[PDB]
């Protein structure tokens, strides 16, 4: 009877909690929707990921969080600018900070595999995924352009 679950910080990942007598509801901001177990909010749309304002495509048909919580700068069609890293929108989209995104079914944070999802981060090179990051090695004679993410 005394219980307001919205006071629990685990409650309603990336959503707004509203207390109810024996439970609680999670209201999801625009572009997010409640997950199957109703513990949080995820964006399940698919769109292209871009390194620039939209251009310089680095992934195809990925989620907005996979794009924007990694090195993507814009996403989707029409283009949606990734939220800046010190905003409330980034907090909701990227609740684990950079490198990670919530699993769309369980909302548990998981590494983004940049090599699988954003292969354009190492074009012409060899990508190795890591936990929270990735590495790109360019083949002999070629060098990573830090700006376009192309080997040469
Ligand atoms: Ca990774």
From Swiss-Prot:
Changing residue 45 to C: In MFS and ECTOL1. Residues 47-94 form the TB domain. It is found in: Secreted. Residues 2-42, 111-152 form the EGF-like domain. Disulfide bonds join 6-17, 12-26, 28-41, 49-67, 54-79, 68-82, 69-94, 115-127, 122-136, 138-151. Changing residue 138 to S: Found in a patient with Marfan-like syndrome; likely pathogenic. It is linked to Marfan syndrome: A hereditary disorder of connective tissue that affects the skeletal, ocular, and cardiovascular systems. A wide variety of skeletal abnormalities occurs with Marfan syndrome, including scoliosis, chest wall deformity, tall stature, abnormal joint mobility. Ectopia lentis occurs in most of the patients and is almost always bilateral. The leading cause of premature death is progressive dilation of the aortic root and ascending aorta, causing aortic incompetence and dissection. This is Fibrillin-1. It comes from Homo sapiens. The gene is FBN1. The chain holds residues 1486 to 1647 of 2871 of the full protein.
């Amino acid at each position: 009877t005394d219980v307001n679950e919205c006071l629990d910080p685990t409650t309603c990942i990336s959503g707004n909690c509203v207390n109810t007598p024996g439970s609680y509801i999670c209201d999801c901001p625009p572009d997010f929707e409640l997950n199957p177990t109703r513990v949080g909010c995820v964006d399940t749309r698919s769109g292209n990921c871009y390194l620039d304002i939209c251009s310089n495509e680095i992934g195809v048909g990925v989620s907005k969080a996979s794009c924007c919580c990694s090195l993507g700068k814009a996403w989707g069609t029409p283009c949606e600018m990734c939220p800046a890293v010190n905003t409330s929108e980034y907090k909701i989209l990227c609740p684990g900070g950079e490198g990670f995104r919530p699993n769309p079914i369980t909302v548990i944070l998981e590494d983004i595999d940049e090599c699988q999802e954003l292969p354009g981060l190492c074009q012409g090179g060899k990508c190795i995924n890591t936990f929270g990051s990735f590495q790109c090695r360019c083949p002999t004679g070629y060098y990573l352009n830090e700006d376009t993410r192309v080997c040469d």
